[PDB]
């Protein structure tokens, strides 16, 4: 099926405080179903696919 997440995509990621933060996907890890997401302070963390939403879908 058409990929939902990809490298370079602007996304909202749910963090461990239960809140959403703007980020950019830097790496997709398919086996682990995670992406390395770079946040607005340039910190980079693993987030599960289900906790990532695309910022914009064309539509």
């Amino acid at each position: 099926g058409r990929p939902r997440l990809w490298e370079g995509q602007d996304v909202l990621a749910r963090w461990t405080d239960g809140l959403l933060y703007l980020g950019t996907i830097k790496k997709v890890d398919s086996a682990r179903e995670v992406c390395l997401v770079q946040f607005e302070d340039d910190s980079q963390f693993l987030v599960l696919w289900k906790d990532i939403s695309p910022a914009a879908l064309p539509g």
């Binding site: 809140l19 959403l20 933060y21 703007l22 607005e40 302070d41 340039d42």
Partner: peptide, 12 residues
């Protein structure tokens, strides 16, 4: 971003 600050899209 260089110098950036994380803020949540919404606060509690």
């Amino acid at each position: 971003a260089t110098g950036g600050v994380k803020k949540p899209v919404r606060y509690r």
